[PDB]
Every structure is written in C-alpha cells, then in structure tokens.
Design a protein around this ligand. Structure first.
Ligand SMILES: [Ca+2]
Ligand SMILES: [Ca+2]
Ligand SMILES: [Ca+2]
Ligand SMILES: [Ca+2]
Lengths: 146, 145
C-alpha cells in the first residue's frame, strides 16, 4: 500500500528543508533531547555531503520507491521503503544495494543514497537512538493509521 | 494510547516462545534473511542470559509500561514503550534507565531489561540490527489500525 503522507513529508523535509525545519518536525513526534541532537548532526551532515544534484537524485529514487509495485501492491504500507530506509539508517550496504536494484536505481541515485548512509555511519549514529524511534513513531501515528 | 496487541504479542513471544516460534512469527512481518538471522541470534541470547526469574521480572516491567499513563493517556500509541524498546535496541543505557524510572521499575526489573539490552550489544549485534524495521512493520500494520 502507498506510504503514509507524513512519512513522505518527513523524508522530503530531511532532504530539502532547513535544519530548523527538519529538527522541529522531528520534535513534533519525539522531543527527547538526544533524538533532536542526533537529528541535527545527521541533517547537517546530509546538507554538507550532498549537492543539489545529489538531493535531486535522492528524490527521484524515492519517487521510484513510492510508485513501485513492491511498495504499492503489497498488503501492508510501502514495505520496500522501510527496507531501504532501515538499511540506510543502520549502515547495511548489502541490503541497501539489493533493495535499490529492486526499484531500478540509476548509478547517480545509488551514489546519492549511499551518501545518506555514510552520514549515519561516519557520525557513529548506527548504534544511536534516532530513526528507529522517530520512523516507528511517525509510521504508527494516528495521522498514518487510518 | 494502549499498545497495539500484535506488538505486545511479539514481545511476549520474544521472551517466552521457543526460538523457532519467535522467528517464524517475525518472518510473517519481514522475511529478509538478515532479519531472521538477527532475530534468532537475539532470541538465543536472551534465552541463555535470562533466568526464568529474569523473564518474569521483564514481563512485570512490560506490564508497568503497558499500564502507565505515559503509555495509555497519551495521544499516540504507547510512547514510553517505544522509548524503552529503542533504548534497548541501541544499547543506550542512560536513556533506558531514565525511561525505567518513569515506570517505577524495581532493581530486579532493571536488571532483566539490561540483560535484553546486553544481548543487542553482545558480539557487535547493535552494529548489525536494522532496529525499527520489524517494529515499524508490526506497528504500522493493518492489524494495528
Ligand atoms: Ca549541499
Ligand atoms: Ca553526478
Ligand atoms: Ca541502530
Ligand atoms: Ca534461560
């Protein structure tokens, strides 16, 4: 089934919002100081590491995910998104690659997504409380559960 | 709001089921080989590390979570549960302790929950787990609407 719009919004802001716009949006779901602190580290990293072209390619890849049969035609909410998102957040390069292949990622798209994964990995955020909590919280919100 | 029953059931099975029963249930939500491999390692670790007494103390603590105003009276689904769960899954002992105090954990209850957290930390499993994937999948499922 299609992704919850609140989830798509969170990823869009993550990529295209200002740091404040993103972190404040996170704070609406989970206002733990550590979560907000980690969210800002991550967001500052993606802004610095990704060019405009990189962001454009991330967005086109995400559009491929949201429109994939492996997202839409499945019984539950957009399963391939969650596979990709959690591979990114926890630095699983193997599963990320496999999952990007399932949605016909271009090389520039793959490069863009790997930069986001690098921001989790290089800042030591794999074993930190962040997007497992935030993404679970958005996805299970009353907004999404309709 | 009260936790989704399917989430409560998953956690109960994690603690009290056989490894095969727990992994087969995880597979119904997310059948990725890495997820099932990790689920089994984690399950075998908790079964070996936790005494019957530890498991009882964990079940008692979860009950405190499920009945807490910080779970039930909130606008969204059992927020304190998710805080605890993700502090466990990521080996954040500070955040785990802060959350446990909120639900009036006893010392043996803290001890039991730390054993679960230790099983995530053990042998670098925290570096592997796709924490959030299974839990997001159960929590956002049609059954949880
Ligand atoms: Ca940039
Ligand atoms: Ca390029
Ligand atoms: Ca993690
Ligand atoms: Ca035992």
């Amino acid at each position: 089934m299609e992704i919850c719009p609140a989830v798509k919004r969170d990823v869009d802001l993550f990529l295209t919002g200002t740091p404040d716009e993103y972190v404040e949006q996170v704070a609406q779901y989970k206002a733990l100081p550590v979560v907000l602190e980690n969210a800002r580290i991550l967001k500052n990293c993606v802004d610095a590491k990704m060019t405009e072209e990189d962001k454009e390619n991330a967005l086109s890849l995400l559009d491929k995910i949201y429109t994939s049969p492996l997202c839409v035609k499945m019984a539950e909410t957009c399963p391939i998104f969650y596979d990709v998102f959690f591979a990114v957040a926890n630095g699983n390069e193997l599963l990320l690659d496999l999952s990007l292949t399932k949605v016909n990622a271009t090389e520039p798209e793959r490069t863009a997504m790997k930069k986001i994964q690098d921001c989790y990995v290089e800042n030591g955020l794999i074993s930190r409380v962040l997007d497992g909590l935030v993404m679970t919280t958005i996805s299970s919100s009353k907004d999404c559960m309709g």
